[PDB]
Design a protein around this ligand. Sequence first.
Ligand code: ATP
Ligand code: ATP
Ligand code: ADP
Ligand code: MG
Ligand code: MG
Ligand code: MG
Lengths: 470, 471, 476
Amino acid sequence: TRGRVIQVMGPVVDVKFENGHLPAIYNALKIQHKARNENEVDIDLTLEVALHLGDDTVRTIAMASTDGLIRGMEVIDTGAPISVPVGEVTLGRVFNVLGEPIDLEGDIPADARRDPIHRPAPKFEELATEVEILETGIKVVDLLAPYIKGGKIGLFGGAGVGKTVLIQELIHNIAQEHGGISVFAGVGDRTREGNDLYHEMKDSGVISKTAMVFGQMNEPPGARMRVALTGLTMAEYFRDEQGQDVLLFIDNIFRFTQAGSEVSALLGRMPSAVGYQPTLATEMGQLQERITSTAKGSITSIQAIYVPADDYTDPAPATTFSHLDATTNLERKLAEMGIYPAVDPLASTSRALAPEIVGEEHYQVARKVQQTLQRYKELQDIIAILGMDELSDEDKLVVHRARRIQFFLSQNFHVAEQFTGQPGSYVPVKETVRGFKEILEGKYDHLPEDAFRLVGRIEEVVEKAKAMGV
Amino acid sequence: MTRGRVIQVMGPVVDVKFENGHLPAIYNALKIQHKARNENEVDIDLTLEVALHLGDDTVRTIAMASTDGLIRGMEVIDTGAPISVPVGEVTLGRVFNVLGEPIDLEGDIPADARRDPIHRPAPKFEELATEVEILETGIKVVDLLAPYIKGGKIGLFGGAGVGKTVLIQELIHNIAQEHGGISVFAGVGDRTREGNDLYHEMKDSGVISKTAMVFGQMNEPPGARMRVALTGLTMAEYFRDEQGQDVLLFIDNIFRFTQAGSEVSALLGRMPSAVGYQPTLATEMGQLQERITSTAKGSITSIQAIYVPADDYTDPAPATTFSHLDATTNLERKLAEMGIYPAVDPLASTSRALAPEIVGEEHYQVARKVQQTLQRYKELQDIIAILGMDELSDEDKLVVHRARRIQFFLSQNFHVAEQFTGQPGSYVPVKETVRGFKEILEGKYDHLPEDAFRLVGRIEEVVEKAKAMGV
Amino acid sequence: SDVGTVIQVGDGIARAHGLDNVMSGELVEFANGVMGMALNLEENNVGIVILGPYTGIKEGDEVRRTGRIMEVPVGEALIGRVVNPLGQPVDGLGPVETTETRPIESRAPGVMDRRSVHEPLQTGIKAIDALVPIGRGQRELIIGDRQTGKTSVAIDTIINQKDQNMISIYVAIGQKESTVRTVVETLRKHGALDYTIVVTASASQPAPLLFLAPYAGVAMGEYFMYKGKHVLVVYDDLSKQAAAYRELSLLLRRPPGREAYPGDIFYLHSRLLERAAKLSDAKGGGSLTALPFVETQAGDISAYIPTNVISITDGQIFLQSDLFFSGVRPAINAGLSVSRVGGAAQIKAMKKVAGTLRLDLAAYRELEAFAQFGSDLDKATQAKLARGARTVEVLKQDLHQPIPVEKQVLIIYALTRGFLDDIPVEDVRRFEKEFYLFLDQNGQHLLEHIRTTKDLPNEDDLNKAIEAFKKTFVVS
Ligand SMILES: Nc1ncnc2c1ncn2[C@@H]1O[C@H](COP(=O)(O)OP(=O)(O)OP(=O)(O)O)[C@@H](O)[C@H]1O
Ligand SMILES: Nc1ncnc2c1ncn2[C@@H]1O[C@H](COP(=O)(O)OP(=O)(O)OP(=O)(O)O)[C@@H](O)[C@H]1O
Ligand SMILES: Nc1ncnc2c1ncn2[C@@H]1O[C@H](COP(=O)(O)OP(=O)(O)O)[C@@H](O)[C@H]1O
Ligand SMILES: [Mg+2]
Ligand SMILES: [Mg+2]
Ligand SMILES: [Mg+2]
């Protein structure tokens, strides 16, 4: 009971299994062939099943390029979904979508258990709703949009704003804070960044308690689509057996939505909206709903999103926005201003900025900060085109402190070691919230604004000025 | 058995069923001769061009004249070759239909004449030449901002009603008298009125002796409209190769070739593209345009017009043909409504001949500095609509001041205009053009009223108008 | 068996019966003698895109199977010639002795094999080399409207590679064949054509030859990179390649998508654009930087081809038509152009001056966007508006006159440190002209230290040099 290939149309293939032996949907298939003659080409290729057709035939998608496929090749049926090896063995390694290790360190044995990629989501009975503030050590995120365990978190931006630099600073700070497993998925990631990140994590020695999944842009669209679910199935083993908080990072899900749109067009369905497939909310929900806090522990996730043209009504961002618990917006104007990670104080929102979850002082502090920056945002054009001396002395006070606040949300970073070389550091929550209480009190208003860039404490700001001698 | 039968008709398209082993090649031609056998039928002589095979010996064909009357089981003959045009010395002074038969009442072409295929491969990279120099033509804007190229493709782009044919007629009045070379004028998508008006214009000036002409018309079925462009080009090709004279080619409207393809493609049976066009837009349009080339053997200069389907240039058929043209003129409706003629877009006119080597430094500096003032004037038009003129200062006041005058002084009284309006026309030398626009940019004549600069030839004529208005 | 009969011949495509053992992307040869690239292996008939002229083929003809797969000729012999994507000479000058052949389609280098991009690709274009830097191995889009400056920037790149080793290539897709001739003679006149290959597919060519042109160009580039020499590939318009794919797929009856582009387009371009690399010292230290171009329709954005390519490439340059007609040349918008690799690629001297220049120009871009309409502003803003206006005027440049990096850093340094306040905005393009002559009449040691050290000279002597020139130069 092995199938035979009967059409090829690029990524799509058709296989005519003998009836009585048809695979399920989302099942997996192997081609291994060695060429009989000189003209032929040796092939090792896997396919996934995507819908059934009229008689015996099944319509499938290919995870490696179909070049060299004859008609009438034998297809092996695995009888199961794409199976990913799960265990502690995967700590430190880099994998492809099918679970083979890309790095040359070694090969996972056949004897180990492997878990299916596709599994039903958490039920209504099993789910729970704990609330705890996740101390990330990033001065904007901890002050103005506090992250929470158990939940989907979102980073929205254009291109080249800091999304990957920031995701690296997260992975490093969490590896210092806890020996909690991390899984990183580069879904449709440029093969260049994969080299940068693998060597940065090997050279800072952060990789001992992490795993990595990659699918590059030069992969078929189906292989770009299924890479996020491999990362899910790995993080799910660590929660269910080890029972501890296991972060899942996804490098950009915009490529994932587009890979689904291209697969639907190859399957011959009819577009909608700006050409996205019909089943946009379904597929994305299927992914996003597994990220949860059931009774064993957590799988809190931090994801980044490309917003094509600074208009957020495009289907992929708009469909994503409902699922996310807390979202911070990255704007290129601040990144080019050289204050980092570029996150807008006014446009960032979270569920967790309420006194019952975060804390009484934290609520009063954050709302004073945002009111100060909002009053600065409406005062700059008068400052530009009337004389700056015309601003009232109370508004002049709001100006002076808004300058300091805007700079002191910048922070010196371990990931800057590659780009600029400086050491950086980590800030616990208490020191962020107190330092901003120091900023808002105003006794330190004598120290100059230039000092406040790229620092981790108000004592560091005193030191930098001290070098300047202030 | 080389005779066939029509099996299906579908308008312009017809489907023949030749017996096995005698299928014609693509682009061959087929003849219909049918005796009107009974009191019900209509006699016809029609010829068909093969455009696809479709298996089981069927071939799909485009008719070259209206299909009213055809019957299932009626016979079709095979010529054996492409639509064959009679060419040589005797062509000059004659007017042909698309098939190569004369319609001019003068007579019929001797049967001994060599007749040639219309479909042949384009000239190769080793054969071309690039020695580039100005086709100086006296049209004030085209002599300044987008100088036309001797031996180069020239393009006129505009919407319906903006002024393309008046510009072509001024070009024939200025160039075709002095060129000293064979001119071919082909009408594709042409009004029959303009065809008669031209034939009388050419006889009244005697110019008809050297030139030859091919016509199709708006009332023709699409296949004829497509294959007129190719029949005209085959004539110009023979004269520049065998005789070696410089040749001038005019095509009246080349968009109608692509549109006729759009009509007949969906019936042929191939899926739409970006706005209903056939799939093979750029390959077949490029195939035609890559033949019209100035090899070393002898130069062609060719002046074309393209109707933008609406006032939208982002449409596929204008978009594919903007690449192929060395010098392009954009005619825009908004200027024409202001009464500025010819309505030439100063900012969007592009030509390879602009380059300090080709025009010289004095002429270059002026083309760019004039485009710079008009582009700043577009920016000021918005802010003056909010704040008013009273709020601008210095460099913004003088741009609106000089951009009005320059925008009017690019308008000229054509020698062909004397029928639409009582006026006499002009011819302006390049030197008077470059001095004139320099003098306006310097501001020597800033005191003259902006009314005076409209529809004028030289700055001396503007001073004379302004004197009569009381300066 | 492996001989088959043709049963359609329309439109530049065919269909055939038989050919049981056929493979996707195989070559099959017609009785006429031209050959085709099998591209849909459907249930009972093979789709066969036809290379060369198709007019001779008729139904009932026979196709034989070549057994080979698509391969390109490669050697040192090609350098200095103009060649067809199938590999034939089209320039005169006779045949080329290509020692061996490489496949058109093959796997790219893995994630481990590459290294970080750390050495520059100096272009000579002041606004790029300062504000949007390129490093060897980087892939960067230039996207703009028609007649804005895509090919002039490409040619300035190929012309500047005389001074630093680069086996550059240039691929022309769909072009008017007389424009290709004007380009080739421009490369010959500037003395630059003997270290580069030019590949031409003209507009007349049948559809598959437009489609396969960048795949064969990169197949030529990567051989030199495997030897270990730096390489540069330029694709003169990728959008025309995408259109050739659309027309080819629509004739093959494949389910369409947005616009009508077939759904495979993003994969097809990623197969092209991810072969570019910077191989490790274990693999030889080579490079293959690539510069694709896309022509956008009317300032269109968020369209299908531009968003695909903008997602793939590690940076993008956006050219503006309304900038060009306002006198900035080559027109480059600093606001919308980004380089993810930037900062690392630059020389250390450039890193100091170009980093601050980005800050200055971003700050004035916003202040001018609103406050220029009002006549009079705050003093500090009138100063920042003056510095921005001088910055854009000092970044204007001529055509086919690359400026060496040594004299770029010295003009940008003169700009940022504010030595140009005394001089008027109109006179600056003459301040540059008279200064670079002075800098070759005096200051050769400064340039020599920068040439090999990559390092900014001592600030005392640099200021002494600029102050002396400001004694010589005469203000209008
Ligand atoms: N130089 C000119 N001087 C005066 N009037 C002009 C001039 N050019 C064009 N016109 C006027 O504008 C119109 C131009 O008519 P024309 O035959 O050029 O239309 P068209 O653009 O050729 O149409 P189509 O695209 O269908 O061929 C007429 O009303 C004509 O009188
Ligand atoms: N740096 C420059 N300074 C002045 N003019 C320039 C410059 N670069 C290009 N140009 C001008 O650009 C025009 C042609 O542009 P170019 O030859 O680059 O075509 P393009 O804009 O790339 O469009 P296409 O891709 O269709 O060729 C000419 O007028 C040329 O002088
Ligand atoms: N702290 C920092 N110091 C210096 N440069 C930085 C810093 N953060 C970001 N950058 C620069 O900005 C770039 C941002 O690009 P990135 O967000 O990594 O792109 P992508 O998200 O597409 O991978 C970095 O590659 C680097 O060049
Ligand atoms: Mg990224
Ligand atoms: Mg007309
Ligand atoms: Mg070009």
